[PDB]
Amino acid sequence: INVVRETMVRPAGATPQRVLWNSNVDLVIPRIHTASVYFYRPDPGGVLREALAKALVPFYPMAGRLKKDENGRFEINCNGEGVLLVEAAAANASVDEYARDFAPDVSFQRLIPSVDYTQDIGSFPLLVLQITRFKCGGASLGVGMEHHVADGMSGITFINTWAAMARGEDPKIVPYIDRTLLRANKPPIPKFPHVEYHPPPLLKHRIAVGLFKFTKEQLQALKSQATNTTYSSYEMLSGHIWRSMCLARGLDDDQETKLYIATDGRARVVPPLPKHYFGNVIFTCTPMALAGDLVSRPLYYAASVIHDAVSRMNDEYLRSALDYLELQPDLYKLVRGAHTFRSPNLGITSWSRLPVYDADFGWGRPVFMGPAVIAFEGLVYVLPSGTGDGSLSISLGLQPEHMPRFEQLIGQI
Template sequence: MAIMALSPSSLAFTVQRCEPELVIPTKPTPHEFKQLSDLDDQESFRFQIGVIQFYRCDPSMHGKDPVKIIREALAQALVFYYPFAGRLREGLGRKLILECTGEGVIFIEADADVTLEQFGDALYPPIPCMDKLLYDVPGSGEILHCPLLLIQVTRLRCGGFIFALRQNHTICDAIGIVQFMSAMGEMARGYCTPSIPPVWQRDLLSARNPPRVTCTHHQFDELPDTDDYPLQNMVPCTFFLDSTKVNAIRKHVPGHLNQCSTFDMLTACIWRCSTIALKPDLDSQVRVIFPVNVRAKLSPSLPTGYYGNAVVFAVAITMARKLCDNPLDMQ
């Protein structure tokens, strides 16, 4: 049992965690090799990404241990999502291959001497002590030959708990991991099988052979290095825009554009404001890049249950002068 003291600027508490363990599927699973899609296999997806969820005390769950329930649900879900229990290998040309070994995923049981209320009324990123609520097991964060998931469940003094997960992004995107977590929730509630069966079929998103270019993909443009916006001068912060704020911004949108989506409107507003704040050369080119889920945009669409990476990046480009000098309705 390891004990760690957590001391963010406004919160101090102690966490006790058990030694990490490997959770394996409850039933034997196939030992096989699976190809990733060319979308999964991108260099830009070869990293780990974390998720954290906070749960209040539920009186109906009195006497039930969330750690035990989640551990068992995880093992049951891995029967259907058995690729998560495997390990990535690297083939010719650095092509990733998934070996379904059934070795399991890392699971950590922990207890924190803190209540959910002590985190504050609104849990906004960045979360205090994220690195301790999701312990980075030494040697677990590599892309190859490592567990693809790391999960930590931390009981809180108030009876609530924190669920934190880290995934290898090459295996799935946010929608895919939510699908897996939903399956875990169903297993915890007594389901025998997930309501949405998982679909691998990564060949659906492999490139043509030979590839055929249908448009210019500006997201892959090589841009010159610049020191105009040093990262050390950037301050991470989170903005939450409720319906009142969204409606206030929409009043600046002219009538003929009033049917634009909230996403388009907010993206235009934030892009314009951030560009003005950065004070670029007005004759320079600026761009905004954002992810797009293509599951339903392809023809035919991807099958329901597909949990691989199905997000591509779209880019909008304009001149800084046009963005900064014109009102929102001209973007």
Template sequence: MGSELRQAFSVIRKAPELISPAAPTPKEFKKLSDIDDQEGLKFHVPSLFFYKNSPSPALEGKDPVKVIREALSKALVFYYPLAGRLREGDNRKLLVDCNGEGILFTEADANVKLEHFGDEIQVPCPYLDQLLYNVPGSDGTLGCPLLLIQVTRLLCGGFILGLRFIHTICDGFGFMQFLKAVEEMTNGANSPSLTPVWQREILNARDPPRITRIHHEFEPVKNSRDIFLNMNLDDMAHKSFYFGPKEIASLRHQLPFHLQNCSRFELITAWLWRCRTIALEPDPDEIVRLSFTASARGKHYNQLIPPGYYGNAFVYPALCSKADDLCRNPLEYAVELVKKAKAEINEEYVRSVADLMVIRGRPKYTSEGYFIVSDNTRTGFDEVDLGWGKPVFGGIAGALLIISFYLKYQKRDGEIGSMVPICLPLSTMEKFQEEMKKMTEAPM
């Protein structure tokens, strides 16, 4: 159905509108934290959610566009900073102008049924531009809406929810917290069960700031060959790769006994980094780096982040290797590096990142020889029930140039695994796929 759908698929959109909080909210300025206020987080993250026509009894016959629009407006009363706009204060410090201007919302209708999408209900979705219209002027940082939303009705009665948020304002867990509030509003709640917490000052730099850890993610690599620099996006390939029980078992079989208990994340991350580096064919002596998002939430951080906090609460430490060492050594070499880097992340590392942002003027991570991964398999995107049941698929819509997101994915036969979208130059993707194939060919 893929090629037939591409020829027939069309979306009719109404003019975008602004949705403001349903009740008066404070007019004030709120500063972001020094973890939020990173140059590397000034990008927009799109996501898609596909829903069947299976409304709850209370929503039988209701229009999902109207239901979601009203729920968003109610949720924004409690998350009113999301209805504001980012501004720059002294020393380029970002803050939110809580002016209640609103989030951008587009109502749309498509001429297909959910079943017509077939296996294309995953990432990357070839119809992202139609399902999440990039309203001109909406994708900047300063003065732009912080959320962009499109609800597209389907002929079968199902619908597709497209969402985009600027990463500066929240991380995946924070955004999910807002979506859960919207979910509760669609089910008749008057307030969210988890009270949102701003308190961005808890992740501000110390006084005086002091860098106490090594941060390879912010250190430029000399004599590095960045093949992504100035690359035409039309020359990029965007594909997803699935890691289920069979694939994980195959990878684990390649490790020595003392590493058999490594996590799925460590295994997948090490494998992807190695395969990607082999495919890119860097100079043997070039230093390549891998970053992974490490959350500061939970008991390991002495409850540093309070329940309800919806700001960015993570760092992305980098580990380094000579390209030749990574490519020529067996998989265990990369797994050991990932495990070691994870073990070194603690509250002091988070504090050191915040301090570095202030001391060095908020540098962006250096992209040369770099690969960043973010595990979203436990974020809960696949469980967002807006009154029509859980989505057939729900998650971030794809990879960025050097950033890949791990997504929870359920196959048609019910098997659950991780789907990982990858962006690579066209000339490199074929080599990458050859390396990936070796995973399933490894003896068990």
């Protein structure tokens, strides 16, 4: 990959010099990962830059820097120091030479800046953006965001705002920037045990990435296997992936397994949070069951443990977690990235609700929106459909000798 330019873009002007306090859910997050790649194709530089500065007027926390206070608690120091925007060019080109089946791999890590977090926090950009053009109109947007500034939803809002501005339009949107709403009460009064942050079950006493497609003529069936109640397609798919991995890993029947589902609390908090709330609201929801009960009983049981676990996270339960996390012994060791989604556990983060394919700059809309590289096993990305099909794709990492099976049980609905 060749590089034409590298610019540290700061807001167009007039930005507050805040220091944003961060809510407990603004601190417990898996690392600074959350990378993303956007793939474009032809349709029917001097503008992408100024649109970023214009979009950094309302979203000034993105142009800030990471900082600790006197207690070591992480903050967002609104420096206005800027966001890194790179415009790359590839000689070899052929976007699908490059992306091929769009499955994540190390070559996607090259559509993204290198950046050393190990350095001092106050002097790396919280967000980096790369624009890599190809041979006949292929474009690639790489996004690398720090978790302590905003969640995925608030990050996609920015990319959409940036794209809406580059189109020659205007944002309409003012972000709500105040994390004191999710402040735990004084004193913390937990009402639940909160097994979400309990240690995961242990397996009873590098890798291969896999991208899998679910047509619409597959999701129909899952809705056909639904019974007292009747569950939804995503709840079936999720349990289907839970069921498949429990069989792909050859788990013993009496083993406890844990599914780490990220949950958006913006809508279930009373009173409801403001629109365009800028921050991290992602709460953890962990349904659990024995490995045998998932795979021996019908698929609607796997949704039963998933649905009843998500339906328990009401305003009384979410605010009880904020009080709960205030009492934890170490602030960021509940952060568990590299070996929590080990066997027999797993994690499923879904993007089937974020307006992902709304990043039209003028080159059309994305054909692809997905993660750059799979770090390790256990994390399932529920991709959204771009062609309006009603489809649903998933990307996944597993041990090299569990993927050949996992591919065989996923295809059988």
